[PDB]
Scaffold this active site. Structure first.
Site, PDB file in Angstrom:
ATOM      1  N   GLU A 242      22.194  47.224 -15.563  1.00  0.00           N
ATOM      2  CA  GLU A 242      21.084  47.946 -16.175  1.00  0.00           C
ATOM      3  C   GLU A 242      20.580  47.197 -17.791  1.00  0.00           C
ATOM      4  O   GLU A 242      19.326  47.054 -18.496  1.00  0.00           O
ATOM      5  CB  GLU A 242      21.861  49.132 -16.841  1.00  0.00           C
TER       6      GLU A 242
ATOM      7  N   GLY B  52      21.455  43.955 -18.187  1.00  0.00           N
ATOM      8  CA  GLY B  52      21.117  42.767 -18.279  1.00  0.00           C
ATOM      9  C   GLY B  52      22.556  42.229 -17.015  1.00  0.00           C
ATOM     10  O   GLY B  52      22.208  43.200 -15.972  1.00  0.00           O
TER      11      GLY B  52
ATOM     12  N   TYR C 105      38.210  42.029 -11.419  1.00  0.00           N
ATOM     13  CA  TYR C 105      37.015  41.775 -10.651  1.00  0.00           C
ATOM     14  C   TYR C 105      37.164  42.806  -8.840  1.00  0.00           C
ATOM     15  O   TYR C 105      38.660  42.786  -8.189  1.00  0.00           O
ATOM     16  CB  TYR C 105      37.227  40.387  -9.836  1.00  0.00           C
ATOM     17  N   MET C 106      36.707  43.438  -8.287  1.00  0.00           N
ATOM     18  CA  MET C 106      36.215  43.375  -6.840  1.00  0.00           C
ATOM     19  C   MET C 106      35.626  43.399  -5.805  1.00  0.00           C
ATOM     20  O   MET C 106      34.108  43.543  -6.555  1.00  0.00           O
ATOM     21  CB  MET C 106      36.518  45.408  -7.297  1.00  0.00           C
TER      22      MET C 106
ATOM     23  N   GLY D 184      32.980  45.441  -3.748  1.00  0.00           N
ATOM     24  CA  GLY D 184      31.272  45.864  -4.346  1.00  0.00           C
ATOM     25  C   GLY D 184      31.510  46.864  -4.100  1.00  0.00           C
ATOM     26  O   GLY D 184      32.212  48.000  -4.384  1.00  0.00           O
ATOM     27  N   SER D 185      30.366  48.231  -4.972  1.00  0.00           N
ATOM     28  CA  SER D 185      30.472  49.379  -4.752  1.00  0.00           C
ATOM     29  C   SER D 185      30.925  50.062  -3.185  1.00  0.00           C
ATOM     30  O   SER D 185      30.391  49.392  -2.171  1.00  0.00           O
ATOM     31  CB  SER D 185      28.795  49.963  -4.587  1.00  0.00           C
TER      32      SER D 185
ATOM     33  N   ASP E 265      28.499  61.243 -14.202  1.00  0.00           N
ATOM     34  CA  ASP E 265      27.641  60.061 -12.861  1.00  0.00           C
ATOM     35  C   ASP E 265      28.899  59.852 -11.689  1.00  0.00           C
ATOM     36  O   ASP E 265      28.875  58.709 -11.044  1.00  0.00           O
ATOM     37  CB  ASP E 265      27.154  59.091 -13.664  1.00  0.00           C
TER      38      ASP E 265
ATOM     39  N   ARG F 120      28.402  55.271  -5.760  1.00  0.00           N
ATOM     40  CA  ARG F 120      27.975  54.404  -6.075  1.00  0.00           C
ATOM     41  C   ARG F 120      28.252  53.315  -7.096  1.00  0.00           C
ATOM     42  O   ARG F 120      28.476  52.276  -7.646  1.00  0.00           O
ATOM     43  CB  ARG F 120      26.219  54.082  -6.239  1.00  0.00           C
ATOM     44  N   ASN F 121      29.495  54.107  -7.887  1.00  0.00           N
ATOM     45  CA  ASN F 121      30.108  54.199  -9.081  1.00  0.00           C
ATOM     46  C   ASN F 121      31.793  54.188  -8.872  1.00  0.00           C
ATOM     47  O   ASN F 121      32.170  53.934 -10.008  1.00  0.00           O
ATOM     48  CB  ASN F 121      29.554  54.664 -10.117  1.00  0.00           C
TER      49      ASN F 121
ATOM     50  N   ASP G 182      31.455  52.822 -14.351  1.00  0.00           N
ATOM     51  CA  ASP G 182      30.139  53.959 -14.377  1.00  0.00           C
ATOM     52  C   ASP G 182      28.573  52.620 -14.955  1.00  0.00           C
ATOM     53  O   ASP G 182      28.948  51.880 -15.163  1.00  0.00           O
ATOM     54  CB  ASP G 182      30.351  54.254 -15.373  1.00  0.00           C
TER      55      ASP G 182
HETATM   56  N1  LIG Z   1      31.837  43.816  -8.236  1.00  0.00           N
HETATM   57  C1  LIG Z   1      32.229  43.563  -9.392  1.00  0.00           C
HETATM   58  O1  LIG Z   1      33.592  43.618  -9.607  1.00  0.00           O
HETATM   59  C2  LIG Z   1      31.796  44.475  -9.947  1.00  0.00           C
HETATM   60  C3  LIG Z   1      32.088  45.280 -11.643  1.00  0.00           C
HETATM   61  N2  LIG Z   1      33.441  45.217 -11.800  1.00  0.00           N
HETATM   62  N3  LIG Z   1      31.636  45.878 -12.590  1.00  0.00           N
HETATM   63  C4  LIG Z   1      30.976  46.769 -13.305  1.00  0.00           C
HETATM   64  C5  LIG Z   1      30.563  46.474 -14.979  1.00  0.00           C
HETATM   65  C6  LIG Z   1      30.645  46.977 -15.899  1.00  0.00           C
HETATM   66  C7  LIG Z   1      31.033  48.787 -15.648  1.00  0.00           C
HETATM   67  N4  LIG Z   1      31.155  49.584 -16.299  1.00  0.00           N
HETATM   68  C8  LIG Z   1      31.532  50.296 -16.531  1.00  0.00           C
HETATM   69  O2  LIG Z   1      32.617  50.636 -15.556  1.00  0.00           O
HETATM   70  N5  LIG Z   1      31.179  51.469 -17.710  1.00  0.00           N
HETATM   71  C9  LIG Z   1      32.011  52.663 -17.391  1.00  0.00           C
HETATM   72  C10 LIG Z   1      31.379  53.982 -18.825  1.00  0.00           C
HETATM   73  C11 LIG Z   1      31.952  54.616 -18.705  1.00  0.00           C
HETATM   74  C12 LIG Z   1      33.091  55.037 -17.966  1.00  0.00           C
HETATM   75  C13 LIG Z   1      33.410  54.954 -17.376  1.00  0.00           C
HETATM   76  C14 LIG Z   1      35.273  55.262 -17.187  1.00  0.00           C
HETATM   77  F1  LIG Z   1      35.858  54.588 -17.126  1.00  0.00           F
HETATM   78  F2  LIG Z   1      35.277  54.351 -15.846  1.00  0.00           F
HETATM   79  F3  LIG Z   1      35.223  56.698 -16.631  1.00  0.00           F
HETATM   80  C15 LIG Z   1      33.400  53.118 -16.829  1.00  0.00           C
HETATM   81  C16 LIG Z   1      31.445  48.730 -14.088  1.00  0.00           C
HETATM   82  C17 LIG Z   1      31.448  47.382 -13.362  1.00  0.00           C
HETATM   83  C18 LIG Z   1      29.654  45.646 -11.926  1.00  0.00           C
HETATM   84  N6  LIG Z   1      28.513  46.014 -11.428  1.00  0.00           N
HETATM   85  C19 LIG Z   1      27.212  45.839 -11.116  1.00  0.00           C
HETATM   86  C20 LIG Z   1      26.639  45.614 -11.292  1.00  0.00           C
HETATM   87  C21 LIG Z   1      25.606  45.620 -10.110  1.00  0.00           C
HETATM   88  C22 LIG Z   1      26.155  45.166  -8.391  1.00  0.00           C
HETATM   89  C23 LIG Z   1      27.064  44.537  -9.097  1.00  0.00           C
HETATM   90  C24 LIG Z   1      28.574  45.011  -9.416  1.00  0.00           C
HETATM   91  N7  LIG Z   1      29.114  44.582  -9.634  1.00  0.00           N
HETATM   92  C25 LIG Z   1      30.555  44.765 -10.476  1.00  0.00           C
END
Ligand SMILES: NC(=O)c1c(N)n(-c2ccc(NC(=O)Nc3cccc(C(F)(F)F)c3)cc2)c2nc3ccccc3nc12
Length: 267
Positions: A23, A25, A93-94, A97-98, A138, A142-143, A156
């Site tokens: 979102e 970047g 790292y996951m 993915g989703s 949310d 997907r999250n 999230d």
């Molecule tokens: N593959 C991975 O390991 C990925 C990964 N760790 N992210 C990513 C990056 C940032 C977030 N951010 C958050 O989870 N924020 C957040 C905000 C509020 C509250 C919480 C929570 F605590 F968990 F409740 C988390 C989540 C995920 C991704 N975001 C992506 C976005 C688009 C496409 C692939 C993506 N992959 C990933």
């Protein structure tokens, strides 16, 4: 942000690939060298170039929140980069993915126990979050991110996932998260089908309000479908607590003998 988020040194961070647009970047995969010299894979969220001061606040506020959680089924924050550019949030790292995308690629390929394992994980992370007084708002497949060992972790990055009362007058509590959890539970047993498919939103609101519910997914154990309906009680005070959900799931993992009983919206 530095109260809950460690400032990482960028020289410890290697970028390997761009894996998505987020979102604020891009999101990348890379490696992080920890102070102890261990190297781990990370996800790296970059703040888009030409960002406004506000998008910065919001981008990082996500890190302030994440940094407050330390749990196996909540995405781990490794740190942030703010004293250099681009601005970054670095997380564990996951690999897979989703969750919704992952399950769609593997329609009907997991055992009921594997699936419950995934759900247990999600329920446990939510039990922790609600314990900290955090309402997610949310919670959706997907999250949820899933790693190479199929461990699921709340993340999230939404009418179909929102409780009637939250939609009606923004009454968001842990019980409205429990409503969303029942939708996630449907998404998982459905291998990533969209909740309420493409129904008009007006009809999603209206149907649920009249007492209609998502139907049981194909070959869904009765136990898991009844849990969905418990999560979807109209009276929020009647929904299980996350702690009870975890307890129920731990029982069904102990005995897949209970799961043998198998079960357009249903009224
Ligand atoms: N593959 C991975 O390991 C990925 C990964 N760790 N992210 C990513 C990056 C940032 C977030 N951010 C958050 O989870 N924020 C957040 C905000 C509020 C509250 C919480 C929570 F605590 F968990 F409740 C988390 C989540 C995920 C991704 N975001 C992506 C976005 C688009 C496409 C692939 C993506 N992959 C990933």
């Amino acid at each position: 942000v530095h109260e809950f988020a460690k400032e990482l040194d960028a020289t410890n961070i290697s970028i390997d690939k761009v894996v998505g647009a987020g979102e604020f970047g891009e999101v990348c995969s890379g490696r992080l060298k920890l102070p102890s010299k261990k190297e781990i894979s990370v996800a790296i969220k970059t703040l888009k170039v030409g960002y406004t001061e506000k998008q910065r606040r919001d981008f990082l506020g996500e890190a302030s929140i994440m940094g407050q959680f330390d749990h196996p089924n909540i995405i781990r924050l490794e740190g942030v980069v703010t004293k250099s550019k681009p601005v970054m949030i670095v997380t564990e790292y996951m690999e897979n993915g989703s969750l919704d995308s992952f399950l769609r690629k593997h329609d009907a390929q997991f055992t009921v126990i594997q699936l419950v394992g995934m759900l247990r994980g999600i329920a446990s992370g939510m039990k922790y979050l609600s314990d900290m007084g955090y309402v997610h708002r949310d919670l959706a497949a997907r999250n949820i991110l899933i790693n190479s060992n199929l461990v699921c972790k709340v993340s999230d990055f939404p009418i179909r996932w929102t409780s009637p009362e939250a939609i009606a007058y923004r009454k968001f509590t842990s019980a409205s998260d429990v409503w969303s959890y029942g939708i996630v539970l449907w998404e998982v047993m459905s291998y990533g089908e969209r909740p309420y498919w493409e129904m008009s939103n007006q009809d999603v609101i209206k149907a649920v309000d009249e007492g209609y519910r998502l139907p049981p997914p194909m070959d869904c154990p009765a136990a898991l479908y009844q849990l969905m309906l418990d999560c979807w009680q109209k009276d929020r005070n009647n929904r299980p607590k996350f702690e009870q959900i975890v307890s129920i799931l731990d029982k069904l993992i102990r005995n897949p003998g209970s799961l043998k009983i198998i079960t357009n919206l249903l009224l």
